[PDB]
Design an enzyme around this catalytic site. Structure first.
Site, short mmCIF file in Angstrom:
data_model
loop_
_atom_site.label_atom_id
_atom_site.label_comp_id
_atom_site.label_asym_id
_atom_site.label_seq_id
_atom_site.Cartn_x
_atom_site.Cartn_y
_atom_site.Cartn_z
N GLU A 35 0.82 -1.21 0.00
CA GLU A 35 0.00 0.00 0.00
C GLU A 35 0.86 1.26 0.00
O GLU A 35 0.57 2.20 -0.74
CB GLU A 35 -0.97 0.01 1.19
CG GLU A 35 -2.12 -0.99 1.07
CD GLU A 35 -3.12 -0.66 -0.03
OE1 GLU A 35 -3.08 0.47 -0.56
OE2 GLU A 35 -3.93 -1.54 -0.38
N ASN A 46 -7.47 9.32 -5.72
CA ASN A 46 -8.29 8.42 -6.52
C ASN A 46 -9.03 9.21 -7.59
O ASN A 46 -9.10 10.43 -7.53
CB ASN A 46 -9.28 7.66 -5.63
CG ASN A 46 -8.58 6.94 -4.49
OD1 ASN A 46 -7.58 6.25 -4.70
ND2 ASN A 46 -9.07 7.12 -3.28
N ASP A 48 -12.24 9.41 -8.13
CA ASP A 48 -13.45 10.06 -7.65
C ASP A 48 -13.15 11.32 -6.83
O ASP A 48 -14.06 11.94 -6.29
CB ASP A 48 -14.29 9.09 -6.83
CG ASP A 48 -13.71 8.81 -5.46
OD1 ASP A 48 -12.48 8.96 -5.28
OD2 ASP A 48 -14.48 8.45 -4.56
N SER A 50 -11.39 11.39 -4.03
CA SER A 50 -10.99 11.04 -2.68
C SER A 50 -9.48 10.80 -2.65
O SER A 50 -8.84 10.71 -3.70
CB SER A 50 -11.74 9.80 -2.18
OG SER A 50 -11.61 8.72 -3.09
N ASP A 52 -6.21 8.58 -0.53
CA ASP A 52 -5.75 7.57 0.42
C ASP A 52 -4.54 8.08 1.21
O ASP A 52 -3.65 8.71 0.65
CB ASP A 52 -5.35 6.29 -0.30
CG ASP A 52 -6.48 5.68 -1.09
OD1 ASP A 52 -7.65 6.05 -0.85
OD2 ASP A 52 -6.20 4.82 -1.94
N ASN A 59 -8.88 5.59 2.97
CA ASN A 59 -9.56 6.41 1.96
C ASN A 59 -10.44 7.49 2.61
O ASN A 59 -11.24 7.20 3.51
CB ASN A 59 -10.44 5.49 1.10
CG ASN A 59 -11.00 6.18 -0.14
OD1 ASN A 59 -11.00 7.40 -0.25
ND2 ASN A 59 -11.50 5.38 -1.07
N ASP A 101 -15.69 -4.25 9.37
CA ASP A 101 -16.93 -3.72 8.79
C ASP A 101 -17.73 -4.75 7.98
O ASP A 101 -18.79 -4.44 7.43
CB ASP A 101 -16.67 -2.45 7.97
CG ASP A 101 -16.14 -2.74 6.58
OD1 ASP A 101 -15.68 -3.88 6.30
OD2 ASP A 101 -16.16 -1.80 5.75
#
Ligand SMILES: [Cl-]
Ligand code: NA
Length: 129
Positions: A35, A46, A48, A50, A52, A59, A101
């Site tokens: 990562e 990203n 969209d 957003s 990280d 994110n 989650d």
């Protein structure tokens, strides 16, 4: 801060990640390597809009507030900049929320593609834990 492999493994183990939700330590170290290359200051944007953040590339679409991802949530209740600290505490605490989650470590694309189903124990081999 750019962690060494065993240094990060020990920090993670101290913060309660070893076998957290059944994921052995090697899984977490492998994820971090692919990562962020173990760099707490890693950021990546990203498509969209957003971003990280940090060693586990958390994110801003869902997990932290960076003030620039409109209509996003802040499920970890932290500014995204806190995820870039040399102290991994905030990243780890947020990671625990993410991995609980429902979807486990599949939330981390690099883990799914590069660690899942491999010999992850190799990532802590030789380390003093
Ligand atoms: Cl799971
Ligand atoms: Na937010």
């Amino acid at each position: 801060k750019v962690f060494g492999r065993c240094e990060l493994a020990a920090a993670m183990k101290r913060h309660g990640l070893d076998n957290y939700r059944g994921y052995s330590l090697g899984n977490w170290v492998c994820a971090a390597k692919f990562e962020s290359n173990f760099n707490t200051q890693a950021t990546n944007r990203n498509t969209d809009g957003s971003t990280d953040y940090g060693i586990l590339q958390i994110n801003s679409r869902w997990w932290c507030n960076d003030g620039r991802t409109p209509g996003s949530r802040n499920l970890c209740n932290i500014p995204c900049s806190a995820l870039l600290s040399s102290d991994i505490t905030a990243s780890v605490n947020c990671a625990k929320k993410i991995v609980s989650d429902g979807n486990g470590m599949n939330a981390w694309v690099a883990w799914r593609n590069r660690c899942k189903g491999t010999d992850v124990q190799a990532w802590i081999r030789g380390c003093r834990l």
